Amino acid sequence: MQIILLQRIVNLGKLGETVDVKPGYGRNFLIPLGKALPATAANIEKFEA
Amino acid sequence: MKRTFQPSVIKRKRTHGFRARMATKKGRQVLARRRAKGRHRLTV
Amino acid sequence: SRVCQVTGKRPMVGNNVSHANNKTRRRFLPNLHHHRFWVESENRFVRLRISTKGMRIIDKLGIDKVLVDLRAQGQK
RNA sequence: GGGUUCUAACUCAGGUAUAACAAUACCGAGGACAAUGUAUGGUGGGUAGUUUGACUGGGGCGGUCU
RNA sequence: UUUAUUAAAAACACAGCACUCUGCAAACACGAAAGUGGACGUAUAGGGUGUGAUGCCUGCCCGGUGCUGGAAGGUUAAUU
RNA sequence: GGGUCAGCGACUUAUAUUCUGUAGCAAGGUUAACCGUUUAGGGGAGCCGUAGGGAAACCGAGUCUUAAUAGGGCGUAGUUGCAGGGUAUAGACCCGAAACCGAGUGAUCUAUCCAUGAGCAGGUUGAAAGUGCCGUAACAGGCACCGGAGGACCGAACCCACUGUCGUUGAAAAGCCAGGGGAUGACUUGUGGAUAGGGGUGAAAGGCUAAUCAAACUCGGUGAUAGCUGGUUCUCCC
RNA sequence: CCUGUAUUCGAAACAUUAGCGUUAACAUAUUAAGUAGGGCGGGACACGAGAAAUCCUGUCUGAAGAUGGGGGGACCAUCC
RNA sequence: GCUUCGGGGAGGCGGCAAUAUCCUGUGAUCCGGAGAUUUCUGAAUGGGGAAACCCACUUACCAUAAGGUAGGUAUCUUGAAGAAGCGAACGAGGGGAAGUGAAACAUCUCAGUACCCUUAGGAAAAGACAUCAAAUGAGAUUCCCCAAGUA
Ligand SMILES: [Mg+2]
């Protein structure tokens, strides 16, 4: 799963970095609790802007 | 001695009657079959 | 029933084949699971009975796309 | 290359609210187990489908069968 | 109690006994599942099995086949 | 095997294929589906025959095998109808199982259960508890009264079915008569309901599940299959 | 001889069939990714796993995207 | 059986099946088109139910008594409109035997048949090449005759 970081979290990357996580890690924790977004163009534009 | 047929109207109408036939899909097929044979007695 | 909503997966019929080639009828069931999907666009969790392939389709297309396709399909 | 811990998936045939059932929310307890799909080894008269020869001073037993 | 309609019994049941399972979403059973019974019960309970009031009692054998525990080693599936 | 008579009752149909006869054409024969103002006329696709040998490539009155040019093997009037005999696939001469499978119908009989009602003449026995008096250090213990237990007793209704006679084309597809057992209980019984076929239910007999039970009934697969049994219809000639 | 037959023929009303016109309902992609392909288990192909192409998919995966892709019965190259 | 519009022209009031009272050139009976009426049950639809029954609620009006007339009141789907149920065969689709044959029988056959279930239309389905071919190439689907009982 490719995701943009919305905040620093250990062992994964900096703020705004697009990283690869296990789908369960992305789908069940980070995105639902607002620590990341799915890596789509419509999301990278939203974050970059 | 006691024989096999012991008549009861409520029991007859409740196991074999018209509304008992119409309550099931298989009872409605019984009725469709009786009507296709043209029986003058649909249900007891 | 035991049907995936998003992919349409349902049980398949087939044969159990023995080493002596005896055939018995069998079913192949979908890998169906209950999952609560977070939807930001509605700020809520929606629980779906979904297949693993459907979860991958959520991953690739988005819960919003899958949800609008289900709503167009009917049951919601 | 194994454990330990965590919680956020998942589970509750727990509590409270929603009339009731159920679902949902929260709390609580568990928790990457359990459980289920696919595949796979084992077990499996619980259940099925069948087989279980012929000769023969009746048949079986014995013997025989090239 | 039983072979309605050739067998009523020494057969079945029985109170009692023993083994064994089951910690509760129990084991177990019906069911494809949901849902049920067990039980709105909880190990002094519930299931299965044998035996069959009571009295005196119930010896030896764990090689076979089951069951229970153990895992050092041998062998061993899919997969890779 | 047949009481008798009358009536009906068994080698078919379709296609493929082979042989025979017959007819037409003849080294050729013949079209199919179709079209057609339809038995015609058209339609040559195809099929059979006209060559075989060899697994085959390949060659061909030859070819194969072989190193062999030897030897040896195999080779050197049909066709289309019509009719008939046989065969093949179909129920395939007709009738006949015990079965197996699918889908329904049944617990008004019976088995067990659930709910809700009802019944059990009459006569007995006399458990615990209780009371009193005595007794004991106190419990204990005794005696009398009293009480009314019990899958208790005797015995009608009711339920049952041990013995015998009768009856056995019965009065009856399970009874009668005379005796017999239980008869306040694990009792009998009414009404309604529940469980359904490899399923149920069973104080267990493979019992019962509508006079049907080692797998109900009905319909369907189905004209099951039957190396078996029975039957198979006019006449004469060799 | 009668009803008929040959032939010729009728419709106030309603239906049906067509052609035309018009209305109101729905529809109107723009070139295609969880797709093609692959592993495992099945199924369908005349083809019973077979040297088995091709199709379908329960399970697990997963492209290139026209300088590309599919098929031509394992498979590779070339060609169509 | 009522009305009307057409046909028709002498009988007629359906049959068993006649009898009586009657109708009919003021055009009956009869035939064809249209309309009106159309009890109750049944999808049955206000609730219920042992079908042809029991019990209602409500709006408007009329009655004055214990009612009468005309309506409304099921569920689901879609945003008021639809649906439901029934009924030949043929279609498409979801499930799917066994007897039988193999002279036994298990692969196989039977057969994707019977049957069960879902759902259309006058047909359905399929259909325009990510199809074949390998010939001088052809040019969607369906059906028939061959190819061929061949590979
Ligand atoms: Mg009986």
PDB file of C-alpha atoms (C1' of nucleotides) in Angstrom, chain F residues 28-223:
ATOM      1  C1'   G F  28     -19.624 -44.606 -65.135  1.00  0.00           C
ATOM      2  C1'   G F  29     -23.876 -44.170 -61.685  1.00  0.00           C
ATOM      3  C1'   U F  30     -26.437 -40.781 -58.520  1.00  0.00           C
ATOM      4  C1'   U F  31     -27.576 -35.992 -56.418  1.00  0.00           C
ATOM      5  C1'   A F  32     -28.651 -33.960 -50.748  1.00  0.00           C
ATOM      6  C1'   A F  33     -30.336 -29.824 -48.391  1.00  0.00           C
ATOM      7  C1'   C F  34     -32.708 -26.335 -51.083  1.00  0.00           C
ATOM      8  C1'   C F  35     -35.403 -23.599 -55.132  1.00  0.00           C
ATOM      9  C1'   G F  36     -39.711 -24.596 -57.604  1.00  0.00           C
ATOM     10  C1'   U F  37     -46.700 -21.504 -60.039  1.00  0.00           C
ATOM     11  C1'   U F  38     -43.840 -28.280 -55.866  1.00  0.00           C
ATOM     12  C1'   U F  39     -44.020 -36.301 -57.490  1.00  0.00           C
ATOM     13  C1'   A F  40     -41.845 -32.233 -62.707  1.00  0.00           C
ATOM     14  C1'   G F  41     -37.802 -29.072 -63.776  1.00  0.00           C
ATOM     15  C1'   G F  42     -33.337 -27.125 -61.537  1.00  0.00           C
ATOM     16  C1'   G F  43     -29.471 -27.859 -57.699  1.00  0.00           C
ATOM     17  C1'   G F  44     -22.766 -31.906 -58.830  1.00  0.00           C
ATOM     18  C1'   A F  45     -21.719 -29.869 -52.966  1.00  0.00           C
ATOM     19  C1'   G F  46     -20.919 -34.724 -51.854  1.00  0.00           C
ATOM     20  C1'   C F  47     -20.997 -40.278 -52.191  1.00  0.00           C
ATOM     21  C1'   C F  48     -19.841 -44.980 -54.497  1.00  0.00           C
ATOM     22  C1'   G F  49     -16.958 -47.387 -58.647  1.00  0.00           C
ATOM     23  C1'   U F  50     -12.719 -46.832 -61.733  1.00  0.00           C
ATOM     24  C1'   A F  51      -5.494 -49.380 -58.048  1.00  0.00           C
ATOM     25  C1'   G F  52      -2.558 -50.945 -55.105  1.00  0.00           C
ATOM     26  C1'   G F  53       1.499 -51.344 -51.810  1.00  0.00           C
ATOM     27  C1'   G F  54       3.425 -49.270 -47.311  1.00  0.00           C
ATOM     28  C1'   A F  55       3.043 -47.205 -40.234  1.00  0.00           C
ATOM     29  C1'   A F  56       4.284 -43.248 -43.080  1.00  0.00           C
ATOM     30  C1'   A F  57       6.829 -40.098 -46.348  1.00  0.00           C
ATOM     31  C1'   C F  58       6.621 -41.939 -50.957  1.00  0.00           C
ATOM     32  C1'   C F  59       6.044 -44.612 -55.211  1.00  0.00           C
ATOM     33  C1'   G F  60       2.394 -46.895 -58.482  1.00  0.00           C
ATOM     34  C1'   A F  61       0.774 -52.125 -62.130  1.00  0.00           C
ATOM     35  C1'   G F  62       3.328 -52.317 -58.836  1.00  0.00           C
ATOM     36  C1'   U F  63       4.804 -51.669 -53.974  1.00  0.00           C
ATOM     37  C1'   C F  64       6.807 -53.174 -49.065  1.00  0.00           C
ATOM     38  C1'   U F  65      10.735 -55.414 -46.398  1.00  0.00           C
ATOM     39  C1'   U F  66      16.272 -55.742 -47.494  1.00  0.00           C
ATOM     40  C1'   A F  67      22.794 -54.142 -48.369  1.00  0.00           C
ATOM     41  C1'   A F  68      20.114 -57.210 -52.284  1.00  0.00           C
ATOM     42  C1'   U F  69      17.933 -55.678 -58.830  1.00  0.00           C
ATOM     43  C1'   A F  70      17.619 -62.140 -54.274  1.00  0.00           C
ATOM     44  C1'   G F  71      13.732 -64.346 -51.553  1.00  0.00           C
ATOM     45  C1'   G F  72       9.191 -63.525 -49.526  1.00  0.00           C
ATOM     46  C1'   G F  73       4.193 -60.479 -48.261  1.00  0.00           C
ATOM     47  C1'   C F  74       0.239 -57.983 -50.295  1.00  0.00           C
ATOM     48  C1'   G F  75      -1.517 -56.586 -55.345  1.00  0.00           C
ATOM     49  C1'   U F  76      -1.904 -57.079 -60.795  1.00  0.00           C
ATOM     50  C1'   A F  77     -18.863 -53.694 -63.666  1.00  0.00           C
ATOM     51  C1'   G F  78     -20.375 -50.717 -61.262  1.00  0.00           C
ATOM     52  C1'   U F  79     -24.063 -47.446 -59.397  1.00  0.00           C
ATOM     53  C1'   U F  80     -28.910 -45.449 -58.149  1.00  0.00           C
ATOM     54  C1'   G F  81     -33.786 -46.874 -56.998  1.00  0.00           C
ATOM     55  C1'   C F  82     -37.532 -50.626 -55.523  1.00  0.00           C
ATOM     56  C1'   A F  83     -38.346 -55.328 -53.018  1.00  0.00           C
ATOM     57  C1'   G F  84     -36.417 -59.290 -49.699  1.00  0.00           C
ATOM     58  C1'   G F  85     -32.838 -61.966 -45.991  1.00  0.00           C
ATOM     59  C1'   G F  86     -29.209 -60.627 -41.929  1.00  0.00           C
ATOM     60  C1'   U F  87     -26.949 -57.197 -38.772  1.00  0.00           C
ATOM     61  C1'   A F  88     -26.217 -52.055 -35.880  1.00  0.00           C
ATOM     62  C1'   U F  89     -28.514 -47.972 -32.805  1.00  0.00           C
ATOM     63  C1'   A F  90     -33.021 -47.008 -30.636  1.00  0.00           C
ATOM     64  C1'   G F  91     -38.175 -50.171 -25.585  1.00  0.00           C
ATOM     65  C1'   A F  92     -36.576 -53.199 -30.844  1.00  0.00           C
ATOM     66  C1'   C F  93     -41.006 -60.104 -30.469  1.00  0.00           C
ATOM     67  C1'   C F  94     -44.834 -59.477 -26.264  1.00  0.00           C
ATOM     68  C1'   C F  95     -45.861 -59.901 -20.976  1.00  0.00           C
ATOM     69  C1'   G F  96     -43.284 -60.288 -15.838  1.00  0.00           C
ATOM     70  C1'   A F  97     -39.504 -58.780 -10.899  1.00  0.00           C
ATOM     71  C1'   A F  98     -37.289 -58.070  -6.323  1.00  0.00           C
ATOM     72  C1'   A F  99     -34.863 -53.031  -6.927  1.00  0.00           C
ATOM     73  C1'   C F 100     -32.255 -47.984  -7.578  1.00  0.00           C
ATOM     74  C1'   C F 101     -33.026 -42.491  -8.074  1.00  0.00           C
ATOM     75  C1'   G F 102     -35.839 -37.722  -7.993  1.00  0.00           C
ATOM     76  C1'   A F 103     -39.865 -34.710  -6.374  1.00  0.00           C
ATOM     77  C1'   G F 104     -44.009 -34.523  -3.512  1.00  0.00           C
ATOM     78  C1'   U F 105     -48.179 -36.659   0.244  1.00  0.00           C
ATOM     79  C1'   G F 106     -48.970 -38.604   5.027  1.00  0.00           C
ATOM     80  C1'   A F 107     -48.418 -38.736  12.787  1.00  0.00           C
ATOM     81  C1'   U F 108     -57.356 -38.509  11.794  1.00  0.00           C
ATOM     82  C1'   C F 109     -53.577 -45.649  12.825  1.00  0.00           C
ATOM     83  C1'   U F 110     -49.468 -46.077  15.615  1.00  0.00           C
ATOM     84  C1'   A F 111     -44.500 -44.427  18.481  1.00  0.00           C
ATOM     85  C1'   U F 112     -42.683 -40.560  21.613  1.00  0.00           C
ATOM     86  C1'   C F 113     -43.445 -35.593  23.183  1.00  0.00           C
ATOM     87  C1'   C F 114     -46.110 -30.551  24.273  1.00  0.00           C
ATOM     88  C1'   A F 115     -50.479 -27.804  25.970  1.00  0.00           C
ATOM     89  C1'   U F 116     -55.171 -28.115  27.975  1.00  0.00           C
ATOM     90  C1'   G F 117     -59.416 -30.904  30.073  1.00  0.00           C
ATOM     91  C1'   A F 118     -61.699 -35.570  32.101  1.00  0.00           C
ATOM     92  C1'   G F 119     -61.963 -40.569  34.753  1.00  0.00           C
ATOM     93  C1'   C F 120     -60.853 -44.263  38.508  1.00  0.00           C
ATOM     94  C1'   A F 121     -67.956 -48.241  42.250  1.00  0.00           C
ATOM     95  C1'   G F 122     -66.931 -50.501  46.697  1.00  0.00           C
ATOM     96  C1'   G F 123     -63.933 -52.713  50.665  1.00  0.00           C
ATOM     97  C1'   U F 124     -59.055 -52.971  53.207  1.00  0.00           C
ATOM     98  C1'   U F 125     -54.091 -52.343  55.501  1.00  0.00           C
ATOM     99  C1'   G F 126     -52.247 -49.033  58.741  1.00  0.00           C
ATOM    100  C1'   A F 127     -45.589 -45.924  57.459  1.00  0.00           C
ATOM    101  C1'   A F 128     -43.732 -41.248  59.037  1.00  0.00           C
ATOM    102  C1'   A F 129     -45.140 -37.288  61.809  1.00  0.00           C
ATOM    103  C1'   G F 130     -48.047 -35.823  66.193  1.00  0.00           C
ATOM    104  C1'   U F 131     -50.211 -36.038  71.466  1.00  0.00           C
ATOM    105  C1'   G F 132     -50.248 -37.991  76.329  1.00  0.00           C
ATOM    106  C1'   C F 133     -48.253 -40.937  80.322  1.00  0.00           C
ATOM    107  C1'   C F 134     -43.927 -43.278  81.948  1.00  0.00           C
ATOM    108  C1'   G F 135     -38.736 -43.142  81.526  1.00  0.00           C
ATOM    109  C1'   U F 136     -33.356 -40.851  80.852  1.00  0.00           C
ATOM    110  C1'   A F 137     -28.411 -36.583  83.960  1.00  0.00           C
ATOM    111  C1'   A F 138     -29.877 -35.488  79.081  1.00  0.00           C
ATOM    112  C1'   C F 139     -30.454 -37.842  74.435  1.00  0.00           C
ATOM    113  C1'   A F 140     -32.154 -42.579  74.243  1.00  0.00           C
ATOM    114  C1'   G F 141     -36.296 -46.115  75.337  1.00  0.00           C
ATOM    115  C1'   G F 142     -41.364 -47.991  76.373  1.00  0.00           C
ATOM    116  C1'   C F 143     -46.674 -47.885  76.266  1.00  0.00           C
ATOM    117  C1'   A F 144     -51.396 -45.897  74.581  1.00  0.00           C
ATOM    118  C1'   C F 145     -53.891 -42.875  71.513  1.00  0.00           C
ATOM    119  C1'   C F 146     -53.801 -40.719  66.973  1.00  0.00           C
ATOM    120  C1'   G F 147     -52.603 -40.053  61.920  1.00  0.00           C
ATOM    121  C1'   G F 148     -53.333 -41.579  56.848  1.00  0.00           C
ATOM    122  C1'   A F 149     -48.152 -43.104  53.680  1.00  0.00           C
ATOM    123  C1'   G F 150     -47.832 -46.527  49.589  1.00  0.00           C
ATOM    124  C1'   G F 151     -45.294 -47.407  41.298  1.00  0.00           C
ATOM    125  C1'   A F 152     -49.629 -50.938  49.185  1.00  0.00           C
ATOM    126  C1'   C F 153     -53.776 -54.995  49.257  1.00  0.00           C
ATOM    127  C1'   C F 154     -58.976 -57.282  47.419  1.00  0.00           C
ATOM    128  C1'   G F 155     -62.268 -55.883  43.692  1.00  0.00           C
ATOM    129  C1'   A F 156     -66.244 -53.326  39.260  1.00  0.00           C
ATOM    130  C1'   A F 157     -65.892 -49.303  35.469  1.00  0.00           C
ATOM    131  C1'   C F 158     -61.708 -48.578  32.475  1.00  0.00           C
ATOM    132  C1'   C F 159     -56.947 -50.319  30.353  1.00  0.00           C
ATOM    133  C1'   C F 160     -54.724 -54.929  29.098  1.00  0.00           C
ATOM    134  C1'   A F 161     -54.159 -59.682  26.766  1.00  0.00           C
ATOM    135  C1'   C F 162     -51.787 -65.164  30.245  1.00  0.00           C
ATOM    136  C1'   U F 163     -54.821 -70.247  29.060  1.00  0.00           C
ATOM    137  C1'   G F 164     -58.259 -73.003  26.512  1.00  0.00           C
ATOM    138  C1'   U F 165     -62.420 -74.274  23.480  1.00  0.00           C
ATOM    139  C1'   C F 166     -64.824 -72.102  19.180  1.00  0.00           C
ATOM    140  C1'   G F 167     -64.427 -69.615  14.802  1.00  0.00           C
ATOM    141  C1'   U F 168     -60.519 -69.913  10.168  1.00  0.00           C
ATOM    142  C1'   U F 169     -65.069 -69.267   2.282  1.00  0.00           C
ATOM    143  C1'   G F 170     -65.471 -65.876  10.318  1.00  0.00           C
ATOM    144  C1'   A F 171     -70.743 -62.266  13.132  1.00  0.00           C
ATOM    145  C1'   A F 172     -64.816 -60.290  12.832  1.00  0.00           C
ATOM    146  C1'   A F 173     -58.635 -59.036   7.187  1.00  0.00           C
ATOM    147  C1'   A F 174     -57.270 -60.827  14.735  1.00  0.00           C
ATOM    148  C1'   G F 175     -63.217 -61.658  17.322  1.00  0.00           C
ATOM    149  C1'   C F 176     -66.434 -64.483  20.939  1.00  0.00           C
ATOM    150  C1'   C F 177     -67.085 -67.265  25.323  1.00  0.00           C
ATOM    151  C1'   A F 178     -65.173 -69.013  29.898  1.00  0.00           C
ATOM    152  C1'   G F 179     -61.344 -68.098  32.963  1.00  0.00           C
ATOM    153  C1'   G F 180     -56.787 -64.286  33.534  1.00  0.00           C
ATOM    154  C1'   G F 181     -53.593 -59.278  34.850  1.00  0.00           C
ATOM    155  C1'   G F 182     -53.233 -53.937  36.367  1.00  0.00           C
ATOM    156  C1'   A F 183     -56.849 -51.147  38.542  1.00  0.00           C
ATOM    157  C1'   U F 184     -53.834 -43.539  42.813  1.00  0.00           C
ATOM    158  C1'   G F 185     -50.285 -44.737  38.924  1.00  0.00           C
ATOM    159  C1'   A F 186     -43.725 -45.206  35.255  1.00  0.00           C
ATOM    160  C1'   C F 187     -52.324 -45.118  35.247  1.00  0.00           C
ATOM    161  C1'   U F 188     -56.247 -44.508  31.639  1.00  0.00           C
ATOM    162  C1'   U F 189     -58.665 -41.180  28.485  1.00  0.00           C
ATOM    163  C1'   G F 190     -60.821 -36.484  25.313  1.00  0.00           C
ATOM    164  C1'   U F 191     -59.456 -32.298  22.375  1.00  0.00           C
ATOM    165  C1'   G F 192     -55.601 -29.565  19.764  1.00  0.00           C
ATOM    166  C1'   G F 193     -50.553 -29.521  18.404  1.00  0.00           C
ATOM    167  C1'   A F 194     -44.959 -31.302  17.298  1.00  0.00           C
ATOM    168  C1'   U F 195     -41.322 -34.788  15.074  1.00  0.00           C
ATOM    169  C1'   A F 196     -41.321 -37.323   7.952  1.00  0.00           C
ATOM    170  C1'   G F 197     -38.508 -41.690   4.946  1.00  0.00           C
ATOM    171  C1'   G F 198     -31.943 -43.586   5.308  1.00  0.00           C
ATOM    172  C1'   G F 199     -35.770 -39.529   8.071  1.00  0.00           C
ATOM    173  C1'   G F 200     -38.888 -39.794  12.538  1.00  0.00           C
ATOM    174  C1'   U F 201     -40.122 -42.269  16.935  1.00  0.00           C
ATOM    175  C1'   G F 202     -38.773 -46.652  19.944  1.00  0.00           C
ATOM    176  C1'   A F 203     -38.898 -48.866  28.811  1.00  0.00           C
ATOM    177  C1'   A F 204     -35.368 -52.009  22.101  1.00  0.00           C
ATOM    178  C1'   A F 205     -39.586 -56.434  19.387  1.00  0.00           C
ATOM    179  C1'   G F 206     -36.002 -54.112  13.679  1.00  0.00           C
ATOM    180  C1'   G F 207     -41.195 -52.439  16.909  1.00  0.00           C
ATOM    181  C1'   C F 208     -44.243 -48.566  14.900  1.00  0.00           C
ATOM    182  C1'   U F 209     -44.629 -44.516  11.154  1.00  0.00           C
ATOM    183  C1'   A F 210     -53.037 -44.874   8.078  1.00  0.00           C
ATOM    184  C1'   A F 211     -55.166 -53.279   7.435  1.00  0.00           C
ATOM    185  C1'   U F 212     -48.169 -51.214   3.753  1.00  0.00           C
ATOM    186  C1'   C F 213     -41.927 -51.366   6.969  1.00  0.00           C
ATOM    187  C1'   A F 214     -34.334 -54.580   7.278  1.00  0.00           C
ATOM    188  C1'   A F 215     -36.221 -48.215   4.542  1.00  0.00           C
ATOM    189  C1'   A F 216     -43.905 -45.761   3.841  1.00  0.00           C
ATOM    190  C1'   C F 217     -47.039 -43.962   0.170  1.00  0.00           C
ATOM    191  C1'   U F 218     -48.005 -41.352  -4.648  1.00  0.00           C
ATOM    192  C1'   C F 219     -46.306 -39.631  -9.041  1.00  0.00           C
ATOM    193  C1'   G F 220     -42.172 -39.305 -12.168  1.00  0.00           C
ATOM    194  C1'   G F 221     -36.941 -41.338 -14.424  1.00  0.00           C
ATOM    195  C1'   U F 222     -39.861 -45.827 -16.678  1.00  0.00           C
ATOM    196  C1'   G F 223     -41.753 -49.256 -21.786  1.00  0.00           C
TER     197        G F 223
END
